[PDB]
Write an enzyme that holds these catalytic residues in place. Structure first.
Site, PDB file in Angstrom:
ATOM      1  CG  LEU A  16      -1.848  -1.118   1.457  1.00  0.00           C
ATOM      2  CD1 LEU A  16      -2.404  -1.085   2.875  1.00  0.00           C
ATOM      3  CD2 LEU A  16      -2.968  -1.056   0.430  1.00  0.00           C
ATOM      4  CB  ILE A  18       5.010   5.374   1.501  1.00  0.00           C
ATOM      5  CG1 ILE A  18       4.454   6.800   1.588  1.00  0.00           C
ATOM      6  CG2 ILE A  18       6.531   5.343   1.556  1.00  0.00           C
ATOM      7  CD1 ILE A  18       4.655   7.458   2.932  1.00  0.00           C
ATOM      8  CG  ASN A  89       7.014   1.702   4.156  1.00  0.00           C
ATOM      9  OD1 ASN A  89       7.006   2.932   4.220  1.00  0.00           O
ATOM     10  ND2 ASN A  89       5.948   0.986   3.840  1.00  0.00           N
ATOM     11  CE1 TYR A 155       3.420   6.783  12.886  1.00  0.00           C
ATOM     12  CE2 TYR A 155       4.288   9.012  12.915  1.00  0.00           C
ATOM     13  CZ  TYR A 155       3.979   7.859  12.222  1.00  0.00           C
ATOM     14  OH  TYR A 155       4.212   7.790  10.884  1.00  0.00           O
ATOM     15  CE  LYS A 191      -5.222  12.782  -3.604  1.00  0.00           C
ATOM     16  NZ  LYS A 191      -6.308  13.123  -2.659  1.00  0.00           N
ATOM     17  CG  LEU A 194      -5.000   3.864   4.420  1.00  0.00           C
ATOM     18  CD1 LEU A 194      -3.803   3.391   5.231  1.00  0.00           C
ATOM     19  CD2 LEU A 194      -6.270   3.183   4.913  1.00  0.00           C
ATOM     20  CD  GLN A 251       5.578  26.537   8.845  1.00  0.00           C
ATOM     21  OE1 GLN A 251       5.563  27.608   8.246  1.00  0.00           O
ATOM     22  NE2 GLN A 251       4.504  25.767   8.924  1.00  0.00           N
TER      23      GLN A 251
HETATM   24 MG   LIG Z   1       8.356  23.714  13.560  1.00  0.00          MG
HETATM   25 MG   LIG Z   2      -3.148   3.478   1.238  1.00  0.00          MG
END
Ligand SMILES: [Mg+2]
Ligand SMILES: [Mg+2]
Ligand SMILES: [Mg+2]
Ligand SMILES: [Mg+2]
Ligand SMILES: [Mg+2]
Ligand SMILES: [Mg+2]
Ligand SMILES: [Mg+2]
Ligand SMILES: [Mg+2]
Ligand SMILES: [Mg+2]
Ligand SMILES: [Mg+2]
Ligand SMILES: [Mg+2]
Ligand SMILES: [Mg+2]
Ligand SMILES: [Mg+2]
Ligand SMILES: [Mg+2]
Ligand SMILES: [Mg+2]
Ligand SMILES: [Mg+2]
Ligand SMILES: [Mg+2]
Ligand SMILES: [Mg+2]
Lengths: 251, 251, 251, 251
Positions: A16, A18, A89, A155, A191, A194, A251
């Site tokens: 799926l 990436i 991954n 995460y 994108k 999912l 940033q």
């Molecule tokens: Mg920042």
């Molecule tokens: Mg996907």
């Protein structure tokens, strides 16, 4: 183009998004590919969509499964010859702050995102070292290896862990002349189907206060930097972080 | 391979070492290239060694020369059409601690390494924005943008400056939808004729306490990451640092 | 509590805002202080507001003035004895992107924010080394030394330069047993009369997308970390960045 | 000097080395302290060596013990009133590369160095938020949270995890106005009886290629930065890394 001439790659979570894009570009650049995933139905379809079995096959595996790692390396070598390239991954997410993270959620995420990457990196060094393969281990992180997100506590812990563990492995491999490089890749927002399934998700991720480019990336954005890192073009890059994030962390 | 199809690149300090390797790989990937240097004798020979004038030409320029930047952009556009790609690679070194840096040495190094990169980045944004070119500015740093060296005080100042200025430019370009990316590249030690001319230099740089791989890099190591950053393959990468250093900064 | 017993400190731009708060807490902790500033009316009033001439005096100086630096060290040593402590705090801002920065604006900002910090750091090492003073050079960077701001191009360049130049100076001082530490302090947004003079500035800076704490800091936030770094409490800290930013750089 | 007036601190692994020095300076600055440790003989002696039971007590705990964390907060609140301050200091080491790390060693180190810091951070936020305590969670990372060591694979993973998880927690606490700050402290090499027990360890750590100051630190070096972070002096510092490493990470 043949930028991965003769390479043999394992890509975990390669069925799926990436992972599938990395697998697709790897095959296009001449690599033989074994993709993993949890679901045989999804995995066999994905492998067939990319190429013929001489180019790409599927191996059912949970990256948290320590014993399955041995079988995965054995299956890939039987299909394609000695493994040169590993893309760690496979990953999962918990949408909780540290404060609100249940212990079971914590352990489940770390089993895939940290233990799995440890198991793959450790076995990868053992099996790929000292074989003149130009071996490369690509540990998938994200921007969440550099910056906190108040609602991704576990995460964040997993991505910070992989980020610095990968440096340890890169150094040991370099100092021992193992012919194994270890680098991390840090996608911003990407994108995928999912993301498309969650109304308003892409729009929120595309706000300038998140992604300065005012849109999110595509799986091929991560595939292309992985081709570079798998290829001998990156033979002096080890212990490095590669960020592809539309300006998120700038940033 | 044609990974830089239709691109038009300026490479400052493109007549030697890293710059010449970037120019060589850019031409090989289908880019038109204008290289700069201080010496017409060296520069015209270098351009001819790489390709024909339809592929690559030389423009004599000191990157510290603000007025010369306008003439460089004009000459490149006259030769090849609108400039899509700028590699700010020209740089000099002073082998002094901060304590032992004379003010004249300080000003001379900053004129090339900081003012020059400012002049190129500023004019690059002005001339490349809003033209659908997939424009890319690659500001050459080094590991000395991340870590101190006790005998490179002014050099460290210049590389830290370019590192964070590049992030400012990346963000402004992204937020204004300019179609200009800005990234930095951070070589570790690289073998060049200049390194070869200093007895014992490469050996000292190759010690594990400096470069964990136990050897230094080659100019093509930096050329390949520059091809990636100049190409549309890196269209989601902006405001990022890319390190190719044999593990120098990982320890 | 006498945390700076016997210390003699120069604080550039010590007559206003952050510099004034550092001077105030330094005197409260037993340091003798010379504050600098461009204007004698403001400077003499500021010194008298903090304490008596035996505790704190004013020296009129522009930090970009190289010759003035010699006179400043000489005046401080005449008043208080050998200088142990230097805070390079004087700085100016240009509200321009890299694209929109005029060369005169670029040069004026670097003269104060980069040349001035270089002049102070270089002379400070020479005058403070090898005297058993527990000498400390505190270079005022900013969150803008870590992340870009699209409308602070020249400021970003100056703060990135100070960040990495300070590491160079720290390493040389440590390796040569100079008894001089060099560290950088990186304020986020701090409320001062000058910020108060910019309508809507504090409110913009207080947005959660900028400062997660939802308010900006106050000058004493920077004074307290400077007391730590000037004191012998921080005798093992050198070449380090100390960030006090309400979470700005954590996201 | 009463810099921690009214504070109530839990310090994990507070019976030895760095933790003991933090406990000592915390009591000296007016904090009430509960130190934890695995062994009652060492713990009760350590508490009595610092002060009387009205100032400091011992609580037997392994930081990997989730259930024990509830009993620890309850015991501290019973002795001293509501907890304001948590130092997650307890940690262990495995002297193995990633390649040579056994899975049992991996799991045991993460249980203390990662799970333990997670359990403490999570419960600390829940118990300390919204009480006007000026609450502060200080998570002990290491230089090993920034750079790899080829023979500290699992340790590197744990310290990278704590580094970024702490940013997540800092942001959530700041955005929700919890009156809880979360910061990481990153010691370089610090002389303790345990380092003294490893022949040649201090000497290796003191090489200029490791610690530019040419010696290692002492426990009070870490105690002093922890006093700053526990105190209301650091009320604008959250999500930040504080490095005290003799220049280790500056080169
Ligand atoms: Mg920042
Ligand atoms: Mg996907
Ligand atoms: Mg699947
Ligand atoms: Mg195994
Ligand atoms: Mg190799
Ligand atoms: Mg050369
Ligand atoms: Mg030339
Ligand atoms: Mg111009
Ligand atoms: Mg663009
Ligand atoms: Mg004044
Ligand atoms: Mg202009
Ligand atoms: Mg000192
Ligand atoms: Mg708040
Ligand atoms: Mg004990
Ligand atoms: Mg094993
Ligand atoms: Mg608080
Ligand atoms: Mg020293
Ligand atoms: Mg280093």
């Amino acid at each position: 183009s043949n930028r991965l001439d003769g390479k043999v790659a394992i890509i975990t979570g390669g069925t799926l998004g990436i992972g599938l894009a990395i697998a697709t570009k790897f095959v296009e650049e001449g690599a033989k590919v074994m993709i993993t995933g949890r679901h045989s139905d999804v995995g066999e379809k994905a492998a067939k969509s990319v190429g013929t079995p001489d180019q790409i096959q599927f191996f059912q595996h949970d990256s948290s499964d320590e014993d399955g790692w041995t079988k995965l390396f054995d299956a890939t070598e039987k299909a394609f010859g000695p493994v040169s390239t590993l893309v760690n991954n496979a990953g999962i997410a918990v949408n909780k702050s540290v404060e609100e993270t249940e212990t079971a959620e914590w352990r489940k995420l770390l089993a895939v995102n940290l233990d799995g990457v440890f198991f793959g990196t450790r076995l990868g060094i053992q099996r790929m070292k000292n074989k003149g393969l130009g071996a490369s281990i690509i540990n998938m992180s994200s921007i969440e290896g550099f910056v906190g997100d108040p609602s991704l506590g576990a995460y964040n812990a997993s991505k910070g862990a992989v980020r610095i563990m990968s440096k340890s492995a890169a150094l040991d491999c370099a100092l021992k002349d193992y012919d194994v490089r270890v680098n991390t890749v840090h996608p911003g927002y990407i994108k995928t189907p999912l993301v498309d399934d969650l109304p308003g998700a892409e729009e929120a991720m595309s706000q300038r206060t998140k992604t300065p480019m005012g849109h999110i990336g595509e799986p091929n954005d991560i595939a292309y930097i992985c081709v570079y890192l798998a290829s001998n073009e990156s033979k002096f890059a080890t212990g490095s972080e590669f960020v592809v994030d539309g300006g998120y962390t700038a940033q």
